[PDB]
Design a protein around this nucleic acid. Structure first.
Length: 114
DNA sequence: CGCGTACGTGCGTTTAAGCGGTGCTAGAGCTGTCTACGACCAATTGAGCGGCCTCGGCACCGGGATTCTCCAGGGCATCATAG
């Protein structure tokens, strides 16, 4: 579960935040040959060293290609960052982040990399 | 083969052409003279002609540059699809 080197705007200067089970770094994949879907989605929380100053990285596209990405900055509070992260994970998977352990692949939603 | 417009057809309106006359006069046409211009003619001579050279512009030949034609693609943007 390494920080993406492809995030040039953020590589080098920060360390991804995790907590045991709850790892706020993850890559999800969805393949579906019926509809020719083959897409991935990485999410990464990064902390500043000086202050409690966090950033949420999202990156998604067809497998292999960087496609598109978004940076939502959360210098305000890390809890906001958890909100964005967990809410988006639910939106995208229909699984809660606290209950991420018992993942059940519903059709047309992301699964993660074991 | 399709499409669109402009000319033919037909019909009604206007106006000067045609017609017929009258009248006027410019100039066409005729006639008579006479002169100057061209025919004519003979002699003269030089301008022009045939002949004869002759040199430089042109024909030819070759060779290379440029242009014209031509085709193959360098490369690169439209489009479908992703996420």
């Amino acid at each position: 579960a390494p920080v993406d080197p492809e995030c040039t705007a953020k590589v080098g200067k920060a360390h991804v935040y995790c907590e045991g089970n709850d790892v706020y770094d993850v890559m999800l994949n969805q393949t579906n040959l019926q509809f020719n879907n083959n897409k991935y989605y990485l999410i990464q929380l990064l902390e500043d060293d000086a202050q409690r100053n966090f950033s949420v990285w999202m990156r998604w596209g067809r497998v292999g290609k960087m496609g598109q990405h978004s940076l939502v900055a959360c210098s305000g509070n890390l809890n906001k960052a958890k909100e964005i992260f967990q809410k988006k994970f639910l939106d995208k998977t229909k699984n809660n982040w606290e209950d991420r352990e018992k993942f059940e692949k519903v059709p047309g939603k992301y699964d993660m990399l074991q």
